[PDB]
A and B are shown apart, each in its own frame.
Chain A
Amino acid sequence: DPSGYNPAKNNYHPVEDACWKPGQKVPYLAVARTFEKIEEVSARLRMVETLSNLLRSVVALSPPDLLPVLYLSLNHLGPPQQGLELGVGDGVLLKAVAQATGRQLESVRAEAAEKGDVGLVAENSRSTQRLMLPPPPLTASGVFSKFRDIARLTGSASTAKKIDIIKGLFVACRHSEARFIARSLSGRLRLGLAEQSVLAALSQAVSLTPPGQEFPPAMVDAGKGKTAEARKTWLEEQGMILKQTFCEVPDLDRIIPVLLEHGLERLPEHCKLSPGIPLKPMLAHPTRGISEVLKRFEEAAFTCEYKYDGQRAQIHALEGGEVKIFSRNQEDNTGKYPDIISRIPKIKLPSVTSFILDTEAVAWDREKKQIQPFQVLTTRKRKEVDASEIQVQVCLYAFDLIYLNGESLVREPLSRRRQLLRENFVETEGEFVFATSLDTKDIEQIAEFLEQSVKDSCEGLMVKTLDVDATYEIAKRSHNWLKLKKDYLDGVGDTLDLVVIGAYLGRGKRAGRYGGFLLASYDEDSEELQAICKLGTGFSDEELEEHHQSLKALVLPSPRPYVRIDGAVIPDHWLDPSAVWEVKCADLSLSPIYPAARGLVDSDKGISLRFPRFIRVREDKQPEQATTSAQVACLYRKQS
């Protein structure tokens, strides 16, 4: 009986407190009960505890059901290098609910908008559509099989096939599994816990109850007799072993099977890094200015780098001559740049066999011999690998070395890495170059190189240490390199002052209030408001509550004719424009969807804000006094 299944009970026993017999496929109902117990809890370490409890139960009763229940909590459908994705829209889910509950679409949309959650409305309702056979209860293996089938089934009339399968899963719910299936299909599982925390709950479970025990499990608490603190010290050093083992090779399909059949301490003996498998790339931390860099790197001798506005690429060259290219978010993007694969005979020196390197790829002008913006790259085609007719050329900027000729280098100082990078490759002007780096601690050259970068078409500054914390290993700290943004380095940036025109209802944590906004500039040569962006970030909880409480009475049932919108999301409410909110922008860009500033530079393409952020409610103004589209164009010109 899983209907009272309680993992919140103190001292869980891996076999005695479960609700299925061993050898059986794990009942998805228990996974749903456990997700409902996790969301009821706020404390993060208590959530990792409850997930570790359940991972321990699975490896005690049904070890083969491990791999799916990870993805039932991790929401992912496979290694990102394969390219598998669910490919279902939230509209499709809302129509499937309407079919399986028999309720008409307008009412369900209105309920889902007032609650902000498809999983809540999946319950409290029935279609009375009684089948002749009450359905078989779903397994976690079965749930995963049906989700990968939704990912696989495509082609003409595919939304019928998807609707059918989703109907079938939905009518097979018993008590409360439906809410979590509704979440599961959106890519928005809202579990309150993610990759690092599932890896932690896993590490705790596999340390408490190792694989290779026969049933009934001979050992359940490998920490027995130790004090909880020294237990925690053993747990966390083992957890660091797991995290590093996960970092050197991203995919659980190489980790979890060998974890069962060899055990957790001997993992690194088999799991060596090699060209042809991608690896987790470094992240960056937002810092405002050079005193902060100097306190962060006081003992650390560091060097300076341009932040180029390109795409991150890892190159993985095998000795047999096949070479692959991978993005930040792990996907195989090779065949976007087959001409680079044609360039490989000339790039490496004749004395080397294979390598792994990291590079920023930027489109390059052949006769102009200059950089071009990210808006150039984003329009690059993706599916066809046709190198005969090439439209947009590319040049490479190096910024780190991983692997050379059969030696791993991730563990090493950036000094020896960059030395071996330079001493073991040839530069090719217009094809591939080192990023220029200046090797000093004086603030003047740093703010000089800042100016040189912002005038050499780059975003900001990158800072890296040569040896102190310099190594590639994410698990110690993910953010070993620093991003120095122009955004607050100027003290105040491209501030703009925009009128409210419309609001979006809140969802998730934001539900029961507003959750997004639409804003306008003023067009005085028409006396009308041009929609310029959607605002959704940078307002705090209680100032959001103040924005809602000010807007509640300000609605209008109709669109007032003073609005201009097109293609952009039709708002949930129309608002009379009575206040202005100062906001911040990171870049102006030529929106193919927004009307504002159309024809002041390009005829049809309007203008909108890269990376918009709210700042302050400008309570004293009148609406027409706000920013004009002519100023907006002036700023755009000033960007070049």
Chain B
Amino acid sequence: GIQGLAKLIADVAPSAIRENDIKSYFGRKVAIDASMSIYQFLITTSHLMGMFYRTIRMMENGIKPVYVFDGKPPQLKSGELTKQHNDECKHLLSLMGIPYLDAPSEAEASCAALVKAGKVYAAATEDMACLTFGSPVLMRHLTASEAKKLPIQEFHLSRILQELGLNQEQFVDLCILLGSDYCESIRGIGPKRAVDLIQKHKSIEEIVRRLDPNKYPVPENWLHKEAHQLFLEPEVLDPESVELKWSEPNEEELIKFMCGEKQFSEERIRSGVKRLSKSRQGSTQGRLDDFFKVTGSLSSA
């Protein structure tokens, strides 16, 4: 994920940072990036053990998960300088009644495309790439285990963009300059510079050309262009090409193989498939803004 931009926001605009708790997100469809999620699940069935139990935990509090898998990754600076366990996760999605999407590229772009088009209200990832892809709401830290307390952090892209006044492209350029996975950035100018330089020079291209000293280490191959067009219009699937629906979960089909390929507590898994199934009797309660429009806010003098 983009280096340090959470720090810039948490120092300049904590107001768009909303600490909230799990039961506040009832009914919500959530677009989960499968790649970073299975990556933390590996930290040999442990990747499946998190894939089972974290999915259960989400289902309990009205949250409907949308797992999005990666396609062709773009020309990473590190990566351009196996799917046995990946498809192992695709196996139990159908076997537990959860949908699987496959994105044309980095699934964080396809999760953000889904959010910005109304099909889903929140995502599930730790990386701010989805905010930079235009997702108005980011929901983070959900995928953590039950003991690691982690209340769930909202970010509001609309509020962030409004408070500084600096548009989406004037937020993509921030991310690139502040240190993306696509290229190095200018290690000679501090991370605090990003909001102020964007306020004074709302592009990376205008930002570099004004100051040309030997002390300003702009990238040796200056990929601060190409990432801007990538985050503007990434290689994503059509959201309405896949109407999300959450199916009846299997009561026995997973467990007949689950303890079989990886010997583990029968009682935990059988109770898990029961509890996730009973949570589907909930997921019911809704919210007034869906029925009645916001006339606006009324401000006291």
Contact = CB atoms under 8 A, between A and B. Distances in A.
Direct A–B contact in complex, judged by CB atoms less than 8 Å apart: yes
Interface in A201-239: none
Contact of A561 (B19, B146, B150): B19
B279 to A, nearest CB: 22
Interface string A520-551: 00000111000000000000000000000000
Contacts of A526: 126, 141, 150
Given A526-B141, A560-B10, A595 B149 contact: yes
B148 interface: yes
Interface in B145-171: 145-150, 153
A560 B149 contact: no
Q: Is the interface of A mostly helix, strand, loop or mixed?
A: loop
A10 interface: no
A527 B6 contact: yes
Contacts of B149: 566, 595, 598
B14 interface: yes
B80 interface: no
A562 interface: yes
A633 B91 CA distance: 34
A561 B14 contact: yes
Given A561-B10, A562-B10, A598 B148 contact: yes
Contacts, number: 28
Interface band, chain A: 10 to 19
A237 B145 CA distance: 69
A598 B144 CA distance: 12
Contact of B11 (A560, A595, A599, A603): A560
Contacts of B145: 599, 603
B187 to A, nearest CB: 12
A599 B14 contact: no
A587 interface: no
B10 A598 contact: no
A604 B150 CA distance: 12
A24 interface: no
Nearest to B11: A560
B17 interface: yes
A558 interface: yes
Contact of B17 (A525, A527, A561, A603): A561
Contacts of B11: 560
Nearest to B140: A526
Interface in B104-160: 126, 141, 145-150, 153
A558 B43 CA distance: 34
A560 B14 CA distance: 9
A529 to B, nearest CB: 12
B20 interface: no
21 contacts: A525-B43, A526-B126, A526-B141, A527-B6, A560-B10, A560-B11, A561-B10, A561-B14, A561-B17, A561-B19, A562-B7, A562-B10, A595-B149, A598-B147, A598-B148, A598-B149, A599-B145, A603-B145, A603-B146, A603-B147, A604-B147
Interface of A: 525-527, 558, 560-562, 566, 595, 598-599, 603-604
Given A560-B10, A599-B147, A604-B147, 20 more contacts: A525-B40, A525-B43, A526-B126, A526-B141, A526-B150, A527-B6, A561-B10, A561-B14, A561-B17, A561-B19, A566-B149, A595-B149, A598-B147, A598-B148, A598-B149, A599-B145, A599-B148, A603-B145, A603-B146, A603-B147
Task: Please name the 6 residue pairs, one residue from A and one from B, whose CB atoms are nearest each other, closest first.
Answer: A603-B147, A599-B147, A561-B10, A604-B147, A599-B148, A598-B147
